[PDB]
């Protein structure tokens, strides 16, 4: 929780940010959102890969044809505004584009506009978590677009994630409809074999993670070979290391899958190198060669 | 629109029925709903298959493990209350169970409770509509449960339905991932061949429609043979008649699929017999042998 | 061979029935055809299920949207004429609708007409044949419609059939993409287990055979239970009897599959009963309750 | 049209190149063909990748086991002869190997020979075309070989292409049975993301295009990264550029898919570079390092 | 254990029934087996559906082409002899046909014979068991025959069953590759909806259980409707009753699946009726109309 | 055959190496094994990639959770001992971990130990073999792990291999459930097209061959490009060269597939180069850069 939420261009008090119960998105999952992080760095509060996230927000809406009146730049300025207005230095930002109070028909009436909200609030990675392969599979290829970060998609992440927690594990790993590894409930999956980094392609129903992309680029900078390919379920038991990636989860090591220990049962050497290079970005140790750090105070 | 909405046991003015913008269901499609109709009949306002719908509401929540504090009977009484309080005789009822303002984590915290809302509002079938087979497929079997009427499911119905309308058709027909007929965007599909009634099973990713079930039971009463089996796409072009079924759509004839006329291009004889038997229920002509008509004033 | 071939409304001498090498159908498989049989009966030359075949010819053309100028009755009279003009009593008729000398573009230009020809010519059942399961699968559900009897479809029947011949068998049995039994290279497949008759549904990529349909109706008249269901490959080795059906093949018993003998290795009792009832139609022993025999001489 | 057509070793007048209506290929799609282009260049009339096309003609026939008595060299000489004898400088060549007047059985009798024809005739720019994703899928992997350019295969291209034109688009894009991008109705598909060229592998039911291969080699010469990988449907909406390739279509840019604009809605930068390099081959600007230009005069 | 084991026609002491460590079946899973039960009845020791099991033993060997020198009758006599010679009245019989000490090549040398063993030894109620849906799927249709009860098949049952026990459940339920219900780890699955009995067909990778078959026949005698059809995963949560069937497991009620209670959490009404009818066979209460009881003393 | 077999830590005479007929592995395929080769080299008897094979033995057991008391080094010393004790210089070693005389329940009781045996015995490459594509497919992805070399897996290799033999071929090539090339009955498959080496990934249900891995590393040393990708069935007819790899089979060229000759019908140039480099390891010509040769005499 925090004071003020950016709502359709206005800074509204947190308490007053309410929508009608007949809002389309509440009944039909017709919303698109993002997960962004603001880090306190050597150069002050900085939004990690800000433009990339807002670009994906637009891409997700594009796929479902949701009309978005704000440009990427407008959304970016609004985001910084909400962090400053709330006096935050370290936070989690949540942009949300949703179909509001329009008719009750599935197809919104022509000429409608979407409601936009940007809320920000203040904001394990060493011992490694225990994961299990879920009995639920992720969405098939040409059904509900897995490349779009839409609300309705999360019924799948709820099923996969809750099942793992009900059986005593920290996270669940979902396979696609073909029986290949897709990703965790809400984070991308990586494997390290003989010093090589492996990760499933988007065609394995894995969402194009921005943390995932950052890791791939950092790994190449470190001289580590990266192979984007379909992975079998057994590979999880044969891998030297395995870790998850996501904005909220950052880089989370996995020490065991289905009760089977992953090489030594602790954060591996390659996972360690990547973690250091990742966190080094906010200390100045890792040079920001790509322009991933967006200053809140511009 | 109407006055008053039943909200967690209280009759709230329509205008005051608001939820916070950080409600779980707005971001993750974590809601379950129903579509029910109240008809003005020979015995006054009557809710069609009231118990069946509330039972499915509970079943849908059960699958996702959403805690529901109200019993089927409590929900049924609440529903009648909202129709009476709003002085409605002919209406569309919308029960909605959703995860409200809890954390922002996908998995709701243990001990949480769901918010429940029941809104009601006042409420083609002769010439037949033109349909097209969509380029989007419905959810694969063990991914997102198609038997549950959940909010997140509707991203699929939006894609299928919007595509049909963008190309000039009234409704889209989706095939499953195997290439077999599933159903329309938001309604079940029926075919009539040589005086025989055909409809895809639930395993073709078709939601167990209550209108669908009613038609099957009425057809048997009329002495019409019903075959629940997987159907090929071509069968749509070879069928003598084809129609859709749903609470909102009732019994909608389809006169053409993909520009190909369906036997004579008008409402067929078998579709007609079923329509008459269906609407006869609210005139007294068709005996309510199953107890499908629930009086609002009990 | 024979004299005269009906070509676009005219009886042309067999040798003069030629078309240009640039005919669309020669390059793109854009043709639809039928297989019909004329039997010498107790009532003289009689075309078996004449109307049904011409109706399917029209249905196959309808699916591909090939314009057909002739009505079902016109085609039926032309067929009888070809049999009479050729002084045939027992023959195989081959109606063929094809896209002729139009452009070289895959999509024929608007306003084009198809060419139609009807050729007829004079026309292993006691012991049974040896069949093998092919390594090639039949067309997937929403690719090339298997319900339509089109020319291009036969590339598949060629692959399945030639492979069986090459290995010393009389016919090959194709499985669909799922690994279930579809049918023989160019004939439907039946199995008899505990006095029960089994056959794959059309959704197993099996063409809606007219001989297949006749067998199902005759079986029911004989009091034999018929189950139209998906069949596993192993079922071929467990079946008491197995036989193929088609216009050209009629009812052909299968005494072995993949070198494995089918219960006693001879024509089974149920296959025999069905054969007798089938051939009894042309002797008068079996009453033609359906009006399947169309007299040539009218 | 034009005068003369090479028919089984003889130059026959166009009007006289006729084949019997009972030719196998007319009824069973049993033919194999090629599409070749002759361009007027800085070195005169030149056949683009002549040997490559004739080699594929042989490969297609080999898969179906069609007997071809002519060698690659004989066919190449015949092709040049057709262009010279018809006084063509710029034209489209169509070699066709087909099963002619043999029996009516699906399996041609042992010892048969195929008929061979080679016809030639005189022969979506900077704005691009509008495409839509078809509701029809391309052939599954082990059904009808997608690597062979056979006549029967085109029933698929007809379904995909006609649907697109019926809805107002210029071309349709088909997905395979898995829901992944395969290719256009009769041309390969390319995508450009962040300066990288993407194209589906043959295993996505995409025919091994010779234009496709040329583009891949030219791209590498230009220093452009090429990734041959499975592509999701959503990628079409996220791509910076998208274009089709084929002998007839050459390099055709796609400005929109399903009504969604492809980055700026005009021919993209990378597409432009590749087009220039491609057409530069006929002006001498692009050095023919591989020997793709075969002079007619030799 | 017990004394004596029938080994290739000879009653050998239990301790002496040994085979070489280089026996084919130990390395390649090349064995076929059965599970039979001998019950103490009102007519003394009786082998339940004796001939049916021996017939399936032969059918399993036939599919893999394992040479069996003993006839069904010889095996049946041997079985009775094992029970008598070991003075057993209530026991579990295990016939095993396996490829013994032949070469080490996968394909046994022509002319080989299999070794046959028949061992017998002395032999989830009213509360039911807790089951979970496994993360492992059962064998795909045309891979390893699911209709054959072979040794190698059990690696699957081991994976499915062990996972369930590792998580605290009594049995695991496997889905096929399509995401539909197949069966339990080593027993068939039944569901009861509105007084109707449902069970997956063999094509859902479910082995043709002999107990399964018995239940279907008994159900029909009791006037209960039986529907053999593909079942979705969700159906387990919507069913009124669910139970497993197998020779060892007999009729075991399932009170919950994945932590979700199955209607009241106790043995259901229909399950009870079927259990009573089943066990009534051994008390004389249920007339043995089919001849399922084979007396040991004969 | 040979004298002595290492059995649970003791050198037992070959003839006395027996296990009870009730051993778990004989009934349920619950065993894991390896195939290792001892070559007579320029350095004397040498076990090829000894450590790698024992590591895979452990990995296969780990996937099934079979307890293994011996470490990799213990197993390696035992292996050398068996070769020495048997006075072998060139031989085939067969390590086998299996579940022995434990209960009859599929799930072995807690605290059980596995039995381990290591047997060794003394131990078409120039012309090439004739292969055919089998009608049986290899195990689907998430059914029975294809990465594990377990006994039960071989029911599949038996079906694929025996079918090829029965039709006069030397080996059968299996396709996966998708219709893509997987591998031979018990050996990995390679293809050579334009000087490029191709092989299916593990996700095509291909076991991670150790000979396969060696070939890939040798190819890279020779400067040959290696592409690990999914391959279509047709690619076998279009390839310039095709060969199989395995411990027993080493590098076996394939001169024809399905009666279709593979480029010239003899051992190809690239296959030759790889063979020479492979066998050169035991002559000293090829430097053992990886430490693949483990000396017996240490
Ligand atoms: C958001 C999300 C991710 C993580 O993406 P990041 O851009 O790295 O935050 C991974 N998987 C799913 C299903 C997601 O929704
Ligand atoms: C609600 C719904 C239907 C119609 O069900 P009825 O119970 O008949 O109203 C059909 N299909 C889908 C996808 C639905 O959500
Ligand atoms: C024509 C055909 C059949 C047989 O159908 P009939 O109408 O009974 O002749 C079976 N399979 C295929 C693929 C066919 O084309
Ligand atoms: C011929 C063809 C192409 C084009 O390949 P080019 O050799 O480049 O002309 C593409 N797709 C299909 C289906 C084709 O038949
Ligand atoms: C043996 C077996 C069954 C049980 O069948 P019954 O003949 O009734 O004992 C069920 N499933 C599997 C996988 C089996 O092996
Ligand atoms: C053992 C095996 C191979 C060959 O692997 P190598 O380690 O090289 O001997 C190939 N396929 C299968 C199915 C195998 O079991």
Tab-separated table of C-alpha atoms in Angstrom, chain D residues 190 196-199 215-217 219-220 224-228:
chain	number	residue	atom	x	y	z
D	190	UNK	CA	9.872	-14.554	-43.203
D	196	UNK	CA	17.308	-10.606	-37.271
D	197	UNK	CA	15.676	-12.706	-39.991
D	198	UNK	CA	13.374	-15.551	-38.878
D	199	UNK	CA	11.740	-18.318	-40.913
D	215	UNK	CA	17.165	-15.228	-49.502
D	216	UNK	CA	18.894	-17.059	-46.647
D	217	UNK	CA	22.186	-17.110	-48.558
D	219	UNK	CA	21.075	-12.428	-46.100
D	220	UNK	CA	24.244	-14.081	-44.839
D	224	UNK	CA	22.214	-10.388	-41.537
D	225	UNK	CA	21.647	-13.041	-38.849
D	226	UNK	CA	19.285	-15.822	-39.918
D	227	UNK	CA	17.392	-17.990	-37.429
D	228	UNK	CA	15.511	-20.994	-38.747
